[PDB]
């Protein structure tokens, strides 16, 4: 089939190159449109007050001076002569779990995919802090992504949600299987710490997570801790339909009161 | 009751001062914790890799060098000797409608309130491109009535309210309306032009008539001079989809080896 | 005379208001063009790759979404029908001394005035650690501006001015000075975060600093107003003849 | 000799690797300390209000989450057991000429070297409209060897700009002064795709200062340009005149 690929770490990052290469080896057509540098720490909104620049790198690749949402939007509304079947965003160099999901740049590019009418997937590798060096297993995450893509064709899912995927950092021979999960939480517990800096000013640190967190059986945290790949289905429309009838009766009692 | 107030435009903004003064006039206790300068344009995530400064401005006010989510998190976990009943974020100097809501800084301060166990509301004024002073007093009037009403008749759901107010005098307003989110950028095309030095550039252009802004939407209410109220999710997990995705995932497993 | 006024802290800050009001009361015409928010932390360069927006607040006041150098450039090349005799930038809420002068945003607005042909002045208040003495700094500025009219200096340098944070009654006089140095000795410090990981700080300056008799630091420490004349052209003319003979020898070698 | 190398574009850029390799092959020792990502667009000041993180990549390389001035300052005040003879910053992916020199990130790393008492050089490639990084490196190693066996006084910085061509096409070296181009640049009033008013800063006209003797005219005619610049902004030659002026002022206000 025909695929469109983006990310939030930049067009020159090791994980986006390994992903696109594997997809082509498997027999697919692939075009890449991604940011000119790393965008972590930047806001995810569409750019409306100023114009945007882009340049061709090779016959299949373009570099854009804007957000991950800017990259997917321009690709689908006039930048390319191309009609894709699906959007895939990643492979990210750290995990995207629990309370981190609503503000993730990797997730924002997949969202713009569905808004414009196509199915979409985000993929992330769960790396762990060390001292020296140990090279990350991007090859392991790519093998999972090509099998997910082929299957979405032979047995299609409805088109009103996005899939968020997280992969343990090991060789494939160690993996135990797949599991379907819900979002956990881990920073409701973080109780601030008071200190003094080298020039005499009072400063504050957000605390580390305690044991009273929500990361048990059924959650995304618990699956990856036990060496399984995690898949969570998420909303694309923030409207809460199941609450409309009740809020209307509430608003009626409000207006009768004041006037 | 006891109220906690924040925003995304900054601690010296005209809109946050008018809101706080009105709440105190109606007999409530109020503490303010907000950013040291306008944050519109920055990421909304919590700050974990570095420490944060904060200082006292007057007996009821603190200025913080960090995000709107940083302000609410610190106030509720050790910064204050205070146990609030509810959180209010606003009044923002422009609207927050349709597809703009998921990444709004004003909305992010109310979300952190609910996560840590309290009811929450976001309030914005719908100003228009043009000397005509903004009607902040009109939006503050709507806010005090909503607060006193939640005190008698609370709301059960895992939900928060997003409120938008037309920029007119109170005598000119037509009523309140409950709405769904609309959309206007799915239709927005890409235009090609040339800059002063000869480089090709691209603009995201204005929406066509194939937009979703008719009867029932947030856009249609404020255009016809009504105040809009929309209830929104705080958990992004899609529960209605779990049974079908599990069937799907088991089939995949049986296909592959190892 | 006709004055143009800008700053680094924004059009809504208390020090730019107090400066513009004192100048008008003394009988000058004043236009204000300044950033829409506090700019401390971004590059001082001119904006070339995108277009810029601007909003007229009242009759003699404008708000610009860009840098301090962007404000002064637009004002002199087409935004206004106005012909100024001098540019003044300030009053800043902290000091601008010694090795901090080259990258200061307050100083950058003055620099763009001189590159385009006019005399220029920068003004800062030296706050320590309460309501700042902005009125004391404004009294110094109106007296300096009047004197430049009747008794003029050559316009190929700019004046950098720093004012101690006290009442006029306490001030001792004016003094002409050179730039000092403070960060040269400032050491690297190794500490730990709440997870046990290593982080570095740039620590405070010890007693070995360059801050004695003759410098900008010593003057304000002893309650005098400091004036330092600074370069507008970074070319080192006095080294040109010697560097030329050196380059001649280098070229004979490679050939 | 012992050399310390930094830049403004980041530790992973192609110009900094080609410079370091050419220096080692010429027989010098080299340590590299540079930013974790591209830095154009941020303030050049030292970071004082928060702490800074760093990571050792290999035996001779370090990656720092901060400014080019932060990189050089930490390297010379305790992060390393190393005693360098000179600092070199580059090779930059575009030119650094005329009125753009005071706020250049590439130039700022060289400055912090001199403030702390060593000699220093900045090198940039003049790209127009596969970049000849090798041409620029051959120029830099010849300059470094001459500074040793025939020394200059260390009270200045050398700012070097190299045309983007093959070595065979180069015409020579030339010593120059800074020119100017933006003083002429006019305000242009236009409308956005909604008819709302916007302003552009337009291109330089024929009135610009770019003739014989300037850095602009040398690189346009295929020569390598070298400009000596100030490290101290004090204008010593105006001090006596400004002292008499301030005397006459103080007699007026009594
Ligand atoms: Cl991400
Ligand atoms: Cl907002
Ligand atoms: Cl400043
Ligand atoms: Cl640069
Ligand atoms: Mn990332
Ligand atoms: Mn805002
Ligand atoms: Mn300032
Ligand atoms: Mn650069």
Among chain D residues, CA nearest to A13? D12
Given CATH 3.40.1210.10, say whether it is the number of domain C1-255. yes
Least Cα distance to D29 among D59, D61, D57, D3 occurs for D3
**Among candidates C233, C85, C219, which has minimal Cα distance to C162?**
C219
- Are A25 and A40 in contact, with CB atoms under 8 Å apart? no
> Any chain B CB within 8 A of the CB of A158?
yes
Cβ atoms B34, B64 nearer than 8 A: yes
Instruction: Give the HSE-up count for residue D121: Cα atoms under 13 Å, Cβ half-sphere.
Output: 26
In angstroms, the CA B33 to CA C80 distance is: 40
CA angle D9, C45, D96 (to 5 degrees): 55
Stated length of chain A:
259
- What strand order describes the sheet that includes C225-230? C54-58, C61-64, C29-35, C2-6, C86-92, C120-126, C158-164, C225-230, C174-176
Question: Distances in Å between the alpha carbon of D120 and those of B241, C131, D96, D156, D160?
Answer: 64, 45, 16, 8, 11
CB contact, 8 Å: A208 with chain C?
Answer: yes
- Alpha carbon of B133: minimum distance to chain A alpha carbons (Å): 23
Distance CA C78, CA C99 (A): 35
Q: B50 at the D interface (CB within 8 A)?
A: yes
Q: In the structure encoding, which two tokens stand for residue A70, read together?
A: 């800017």
Residues in chain D: 254
Ligand 6 center–CA B97 separation, angstroms:
13
Q: For an interface test with B, which of A68, A76, A77 has the most B Cβ atoms less than 10 Å from its Cβ?
A: A77
Distance CA B185, CA B192 (A): 18
Annotated binding-site residue? D159: no
Q: B144 and chain A: CB distance < 8 Å anywhere?
A: no
Strands (E), chain B: 2-6, 29-35, 52-58, 61-64, 86-92, 120-126, 159-166, 176-178, 190-194, 200-204, 227-233
**Dihedrals phi, psi of A8, to nearest 5 degrees:** -115, -10
Tokens (6 digits) for C65: 């979404």
Please tell me the number of the ligand nearest to residue A104's CA.
1
- Distance, in Å, from the CA atom of A28 to the CA atom of B185, rounded to the nearest integer, reads 30
Residue D116: half-sphere exposure toward Cβ, Cα within 13 Å: 25
- Considering only the C-alpha atoms of chain A, give the largest distance between any 2 of them, rounded to a whole number of Å: 70
B206/D188 CB distance under 8 A: no
Nearest to D112 by CA among D100, D122, D97: D122
Query: What span, in angstroms and rounded, lies between the C-alpha atoms of A41 and A18?
Result: 24
Task: Note whether C166 and C47 are within 8 A (CB).
Answer: no
Closest chain C residue to D201, measured at CA: C48
CATH label, D1-254, candidates 3.40.1210.10, 1.10.240.10, 3.30.565.10, 3.40.1280.10: 3.40.1210.10
With b for 16 or more beta-carbon neighbours within 10 A and e for fewer, the B165-174 pattern comes to bbbeeeeebe
Residue with tokens 């992004």: B236
Q: Whose structure tokens read 């190393």?
A: D82
Q: List chain D residues with CB under 8 Å of B129.
A: 196
CATH superfamily membership of B1-258: Survival protein SurE-like phosphatase/nucleotidase (3.40.1210.10)
The residues spanned by each domain of chain A are 1-259
Distance CA C124, CA C226 (A): 10
Contacts of residues C100-103 at CB distance under 8 Å and 24 or more positions apart, as own/partner, are C100/D45, C101/C160, C101/C179, C101/C230, C101/D233, C102/D102, C102/D111, C102/D233, C103/C44, C103/D43, C103/D44, C103/D45, C103/D108
Closest CA relative to residue D139, chosen from D225, D14, D29: D225
Among B50, B197, B206, the residue with its CB nearest the CB of D193 is B206
- Contact of B47 with chain C, judged by CB distance below 8 Å, is answered with no
Chain C residues within 8 A of D108 when measuring between CB atoms? 103
How far is CA D36 from each of CA A135, D31, D92, rounded to the nearest angstrom?
Answer: 18, 16, 16
Chain C within 8 Å of A131 (Cβ-Cβ)? no
Size of interface A-B (CB pairs under 8 A): 201
Residue in the block written with tokens 């703009």? B100
Min CA distance, A30 vs chain D (Å)?
25
Question: Does D14 touch chain B if contact means CB atoms closer than 8 Å?
Answer: no
SS3 C206: coil
Of A161, A191, A195, the CB nearest to B241: A161
Closest alpha carbon within chain C to A199: C204
Q: Which chains touch C (3 or more CB pairs under 8 A)?
A: A, B, D
Tokens of D117: 């008492």
Contact A247 B178 (CB under 8 A): yes
Measured between CA atoms, the residue of chain C closest to residue A193 is: C194
The shortest CB-CB distance from B178 to any of A177, A202, A251 is to: A251
Asked whether the beta carbons of C173 and C224 are under 8 A apart, the reply is yes
Residue among C124, D232, B170, B249 at smallest CA distance from A259: B170
C132 in Cβ contact with C103 (< 8 Å): no
As a whole number of angstroms, the distance between CA D210 and CA D216 comes to 6
Handedness of CA D75, D80, D81, D85 (dihedral sign): negative
Paired tokens of A127: 């790396």
B92 labelled ligand-binding: yes
For residues D116-139, one letter each, b for 16 or more C-beta atoms within 10 angstroms of the residue's C-beta and e for the rest, the string is bebbbbbbbbbeeeeebbebbbeb
In whole angstroms, what is the distance from residue C143 CA to residue C174 CA?
12
Going from the Cα of B40 to the center of ligand 6, the distance in angstroms, rounded, reads 5
Pairing relationship of beta strands C198-202 and C188-192 according to DSSP bridges = antiparallel
Nearest to A240 among B41, B42, B233 (CB): B233
- CA D77 to centroid of ligand 3, rounded, Å: 26
C195–A193 C-beta distance less than 8 A: no
Beta bridge partners of residue C120, listed in sequence order: C87
- Kindly list the partner chains of chain A, i.e. chains with 3 or more CB atom pairs below 8 Å: B, C, D
Q: Specify the 3-state DSSP secondary structure of C33.
A: strand
Q: Provide the pairing of β-strand D224-229 with D173-175.
A: parallel
Looking at the domain A1-259, which fold is it? Stationary-phase Survival Protein Sure Homolog; Chain: A, (3.40.1210)
A193: which chain C residues are within 8 Å (Cβ-Cβ)?
Answer: 194
Contact C53 A49 (CB under 8 A): yes
Cα–Cα distances in Å, from A165 out to A3, A121, A154? 18, 8, 20
Cβ atoms < 10 Å from Cβ of B55: 12
Nearest to A205 among C51, C194, C203 (CB): C194
Chain B contacts of A40, Cβ < 8 Å? Answer: 43
Taking alpha carbons only, the member of A65, A66, D69 closest to residue C184 is D69
Q: What is the DSSP letter of C42?
A: B
Q: Inter-chain contact C183–D235, Cβ cutoff 8 Å?
A: no
Q: Decide if A5 contacts A22 (C-beta within 8 A).
A: no
Asked if residues C145 and C183 have their Cβ atoms less than 8 Å apart, the reply is no
Would an 8 Å CB–CB cutoff place D61 in contact with chain A? no
Q: Please tell me the distance in Å from A137's CA to the nearest CA on chain B.
A: 18
Q: Tokens 């166990």 — which residue?
A: B117
Beta bridge partners of D187: D201
């Amino acid at each position: 089939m025909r695929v469109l690929v983006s990310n939030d770490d930049g067009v020159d990052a090791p994980g986006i190159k390994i992903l696109a290469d594997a997809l082509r080896n498997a027999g697919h057509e692939v075009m890449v449109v991604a940011p000119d540098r790393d965008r972590s720490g930047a806001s995810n909104s569409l750019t409306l007050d100023t114009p945007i620049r882009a340049k061709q790198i090779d016959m299949h690749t373009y570099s854009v001076a804007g957000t991950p949402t800017d990259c997917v939007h321009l690709a689908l509304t006039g930048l390319l002569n191309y009609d894709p079947d699906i959007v895939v965003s990643g492979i990210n160099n750290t995990g995207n779990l629990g309370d981190d999901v609503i503000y993730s740049g990797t997730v924002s590019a997949a969202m713009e995919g569905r808004f414009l009418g196509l199915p979409a997937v985000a993929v992330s590798l769960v790396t762990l802090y060390r001292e020296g060096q140990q090279a990350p297993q991007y090859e392991t995450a790519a093998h999972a992504a090509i099998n997910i893509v082929a299957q979405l064709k032979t047995d299609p899912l409805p088109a009103d949600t996005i899939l968020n995927v997280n992969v343990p950092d090991v060789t494939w021979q160690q993996m135990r299987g797949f599991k379907v999960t819900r979002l956990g939480n881990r920073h409701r517990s973080a109780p601030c710490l008071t200190q003094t800096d080298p020039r005499g000013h009072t400063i504050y640190w957000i605390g580390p997570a305690g044991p009273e967190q929500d990361a048990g059986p059924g959650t995304d945290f618990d699956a990856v801790r036990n060496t399984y790949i995690s898949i969570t289905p998420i909303h694309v429309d923030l409207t809460r339909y199941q609450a409309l009838e009740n809020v209307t009766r509430w608003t009626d009692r409000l207006t009768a009161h004041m006037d």
